[PDB]
Each structure stands twice: as structure tokens, then as C-alpha cells.
Design an enzyme around this catalytic site. Structure first.
Site, PDB file in Angstrom:
ATOM      1  N   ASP A 107       0.843  -1.279   0.123  1.00  0.00           N
ATOM      2  CA  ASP A 107      -0.055   0.040  -0.069  1.00  0.00           C
ATOM      3  C   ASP A 107       0.715   1.095   0.005  1.00  0.00           C
ATOM      4  O   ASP A 107       2.092   1.188  -0.047  1.00  0.00           O
ATOM      5  CB  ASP A 107      -0.894   0.008   1.289  1.00  0.00           C
ATOM      6  CG  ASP A 107      -0.336   0.261   2.694  1.00  0.00           C
ATOM      7  OD1 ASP A 107       0.925   0.350   2.789  1.00  0.00           O
ATOM      8  OD2 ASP A 107      -1.191   0.434   3.494  1.00  0.00           O
ATOM      9  N   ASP A 137       1.169   4.934   2.312  1.00  0.00           N
ATOM     10  CA  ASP A 137       0.676   5.521   3.422  1.00  0.00           C
ATOM     11  C   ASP A 137       1.224   7.206   3.386  1.00  0.00           C
ATOM     12  O   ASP A 137       2.200   7.655   2.996  1.00  0.00           O
ATOM     13  CB  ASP A 137       1.437   5.030   4.611  1.00  0.00           C
ATOM     14  CG  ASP A 137       1.333   3.509   4.812  1.00  0.00           C
ATOM     15  OD1 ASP A 137       0.267   3.111   4.965  1.00  0.00           O
ATOM     16  OD2 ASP A 137       2.343   2.828   4.728  1.00  0.00           O
ATOM     17  N   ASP A 156      -3.558   4.314   2.945  1.00  0.00           N
ATOM     18  CA  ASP A 156      -3.759   4.750   4.345  1.00  0.00           C
ATOM     19  C   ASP A 156      -3.433   6.323   4.526  1.00  0.00           C
ATOM     20  O   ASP A 156      -2.399   6.650   4.197  1.00  0.00           O
ATOM     21  CB  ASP A 156      -3.036   3.870   5.432  1.00  0.00           C
ATOM     22  CG  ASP A 156      -3.187   2.414   5.270  1.00  0.00           C
ATOM     23  OD1 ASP A 156      -4.192   2.001   4.925  1.00  0.00           O
ATOM     24  OD2 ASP A 156      -2.432   1.833   5.497  1.00  0.00           O
TER      25      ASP A 156
HETATM   26 MG   LIG Z   1       2.538   0.913   3.654  1.00  0.00          MG
HETATM   27 ZN   LIG Z   2      -0.128   1.257   5.462  1.00  0.00          ZN
END
Ligand SMILES: [Mg+2]
Ligand SMILES: [Zn+2]
Ligand SMILES: Nc1ncnc2c1ncn2[C@@H]1O[C@H](COP(=O)(O)OP(=O)(O)OP(=O)(O)OP(=O)(O)OP(=O)(O)OC[C@H]2O[C@@H](n3cnc4c(N)ncnc43)[C@H](O)[C@@H]2O)[C@@H](O)[C@H]1O
Ligand SMILES: [Zn+2]
Ligand SMILES: [Zn+2]
Ligand SMILES: [Zn+2]
Ligand SMILES: [Zn+2]
Ligand SMILES: [Zn+2]
Ligand SMILES: [Zn+2]
Length: 338
Positions: free
Chosen positions: A196, A198, A262
């Protein structure tokens, strides 16, 4: 110079000369249930971490002399790897009947150890059989995990992380023009891939209310544009799946890719602590907090640094000031890959 037992006192770059050892220890630390060898997951983690910091490959048992965090159990694993280039202990985890299923099931967004275990004990071994089953009930997170599986299992690369950064910045600036948006996690530590992306969002002028409302404003803005695929809102945070148009990607290379994102919103004065916490790695953060407690009688987390002797919170406008309060030489983000 002797090697510190603390990751926060070592420089750990992605130039790992001991990947043969580290990959085996990481398998053993990750798979406690599937493991058949005596040793603690904490011992495997700390040993994997020290090996990652070494400026040379271990090629004999004599090379292990003077290295901390290498217990008797860890040394037997190192020995076995030197012997034929493979770990019989890690290999038994990889050949465990549950291993393949647990790795496969937990690779789905919304699926943890409890659900993976429930499905395995029901006789499931493949995703195809799980997805097509008529009796199973899925959480909304798991439905998104299954719908966007192929995209999510492909890891995000840097051109994609940067294209996401542009989307995040354009959305955030719409509601808070003075907002600072910083990519955190693995990408900030120099990684070329991630599961992912962030971000840490902070605003020097936002009120307590504007900062509470921001993530709701940004996600509604993305929903209106047809970009929000999934949304779930210590600090205020959200776990999202965004629709990324590959035409927005500046690289060498359906027309879109699903990306896990995120977002963390923090008060401006706590930005250094949140940045430090969200940059990681997990082992680096663990050691920093352990060092602060055992060596300095200080309490450190993602929000603050408290000195138990002086009975005072220590302020910091940068990560450098946190390290200085702790009496540590500064470790750059790309040197925190513990
Ligand atoms: Mg990450
Ligand atoms: Zn994350
Ligand atoms: O291993 P590997 O399997 O190779 O990759 P990964 O850890 O799954 O991929 P990332 O490293 O990109 O994602 P992450 O959420 O695991 O955190 P990250 O290392 O980037 O980031 C490291 C730090 O960011 C934090 N963090 C990032 N994502 C989350 C999450 N959603 N929940 C709690 N903490 C998170 C942690 O506090 C950690 O200290
Ligand atoms: Zn279990
Ligand atoms: Zn354990
Ligand atoms: Zn791409
Ligand atoms: Zn370009
Ligand atoms: Zn402790
Ligand atoms: Zn706190």
C-alpha cells in the site's frame, strides 16, 4: 566498533548481504503456529534485524562472534544455512499443510489469521472455492479484497505511489490549502514496492473541527468522482482502496489499478512523532520505544515523548529533535529498514 542490540543504534539500509539468513528467520518469526523448532518469534525478529544491519555476508560460524541477539537456537539456523544454502526449519514451515492456505487466505484484504483458520478448518484450500461458496458470509472489507484481488496482490510501485500522492494532494488542498502531505511507510524508507501507500496529513492553521472533518471531505470528494472503491474511517485515520488511472502514472511502461491507501491526520505540533511512528520499520519503532524505556526512562509513542524523571513532555518540530532528546545519533529514514 561493537554492534548495538538496539535497531535505533544501527544503520539498516536495503543493502542486505544476508538475505539467505534473513528470509529464513522472517519465515520462522511469521509462522509461530506452523513452526516445529524451539525458539521465540522475538528472538528470530531481533536476529533477522541485526543481520540486516551487517556490512558483510556471514560465510562461517566464526563471523557470528561479537554479534548480539544471536542465541543458541538462531546459531543452529545460521549453521544449517551455511551448510547447504537452505534452512530445514524454514523449509518445514513452507511444507506445512496449513502454510500455503494461510499465506493465500491472508493475502486477501480484510482476511486475518482468525478467518484464514476458520476457512482452512472448513476444508477450503483455494480462493476460487471460497469466493464461489454459497454459505460463506463476507465482511464489506473482504468483498473489496475479493473484487480487486489481482490489483491488490500486485504490489504498488514508486511511479504508482507518486501518482497516488498527486491525487491525495489535490483532494486535501481543496479543503485545507495550507496542508502538508507526506508519504510515509516503506516508500519513505527507500523501498521500490509496497502492499500500500501511506500518507501523513497535517495543517499549521486548521481548527480541531476542520482537522476532524478533512478525511470525510476528501473521501466524499473521491466518491463523487467515482474513485473510492473502499473506505473505512490513535490519530484520525482511514483505510482506503482508490481507483488509479494508469494515464496519471509517469513510468517507462483495464486502464486503471486498485491501490490500497492509508491516510493519517495529526495535529501540527505532533507531526514529528507521527512521522517517526508511520515511517517505521516495525522493528526500528519497537527498538526506539524499548531504548527510550530501558536506557532513558522516557515514554515514546506516535503522539509524544514523555520524560518520567523530569515529569515533562518533550517538544520536537523534527525527527532530528526526537533523536537528540533521546541522546541518539540521527538515523535517516532509509537507514531504518531494521
Ligand atoms: Mg505501507
Ligand atoms: Zn499502511
Ligand atoms: O513486508 P512485505 O510483505 O514485503 O510488505 P508490507 O509490509 O505488507 O507492505 P508495506 O511495507 O508497504 O505496508 P504496511 O502497512 O505493512 O506498513 P509500512 O512498512 O509501509 O509502514 C511502517 C509503519 O507504518 C505503520 N502502518 C502502515 N500501515 C499500517 C496499517 N494499516 N495499520 C497499522 N499501522 C500501519 C506502522 O505503525 C509501522 O511502524
Ligand atoms: Zn491459531
Ligand atoms: Zn511467538
Ligand atoms: Zn503501474
Ligand atoms: Zn511522464
Ligand atoms: Zn521493556
Ligand atoms: Zn500517546
Amino acid at each position: 566498533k561493537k554492534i548495538s542490540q538496539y535497531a535505533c543504534q544501527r544503520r539498516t539500509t536495503l543493502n542486505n548481504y544476508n538475505q539467505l539468513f534473513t528470509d529464513a528467520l522472517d519465515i520462522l518469526a511469521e509462522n509461530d503456529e506452523l513452526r516445529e523448532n524451539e525458539g521465540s518469534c522475538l528472538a528470530f525478529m531481533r536476529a533477522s534485524s541485526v543481520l540486516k544491519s551487517l556490512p558483510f555476508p556471514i560465510t562461517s560460524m566464526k563471523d557470528t562472534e561479537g554479534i548480539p541477539c544471536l542465541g543458541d537456537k538462531v546459531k543452529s539456523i545460521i549453521e544449517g544455512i551455511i551448510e547447504d544454502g537452505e534452512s530445514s526449519e524454514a523449509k518445514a514451515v513452507l511444507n506445512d499443510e496449513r502454510y500455503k492456505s494461510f499465506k493465500l487466505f491472508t493475502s486477501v484484504f480484510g482476511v486475518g489469521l482468525k478467518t484464514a483458520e476458520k476457512w482452512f478448518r472448513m476444508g477450503f484450500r483455494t480462493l476460487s472455492k471460497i469466493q464461489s461458496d454459497k454459505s460463506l458470509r463476507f465482511t464489506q472489507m473482504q468483498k473489496a479484497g475479493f473484487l480487486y484481488y489481482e490489483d491488490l496482490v500486485s504490489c504498488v510501485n514508486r511511479p504508482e505511489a507518486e501518482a497516488v500522492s498527486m491525487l491525495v494532494k489535490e483532494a486535501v488542498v481543496t479543503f485545507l490549502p495550507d496542508a502538508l502531505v507526506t508519504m510515509t511507510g516503506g516508500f519513505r524508507r527507500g523501498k521500490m514496492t509496497g502492499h500500500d501507500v501511506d500518507f501523513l496529513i497535517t495543517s499549521p492553521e486548521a481548527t480541531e473541527d476542520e482537522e476532524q472533518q478533512l478525511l470525510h471531505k476528501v473521501t466524499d470528494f473521491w466518491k463523487q468522482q467515482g474513485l473510492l472503491l473502499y473506505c473505512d474511517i490513535h490519530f484520525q485515520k482511514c483505510f482506503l482502496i482508490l481507483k488509479l488511472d494508469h494515464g496519471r502514472v509517469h513510468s517507462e511502461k483495464k486502464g486503471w489499478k486498485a491501490i490500497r491507501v492509508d491516510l493519517v491526520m495529526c495535529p501540527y505540533d505532533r507531526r514529528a512523532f507521527a512521522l517517526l511512528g508511520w515511517t517505521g520499520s516495525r522493528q526500528f519503532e519497537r527498538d526506539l520505544r524499548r531504548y527510550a524505556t530501558h536506557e532513558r526512562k522516557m515514554m515514546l509513542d506516535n503522539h509524544a515523548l514523555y520524560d518520567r524523571t523530569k515529569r515533562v513532555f518533550l517538544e520536537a518540530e523534527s525527527e532530528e529533535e526526537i533523536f537528540a532528546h533521546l541522546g541518539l545519533d540521527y538515523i535517516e529514514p532509509w537507514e531504518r529498514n531494521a
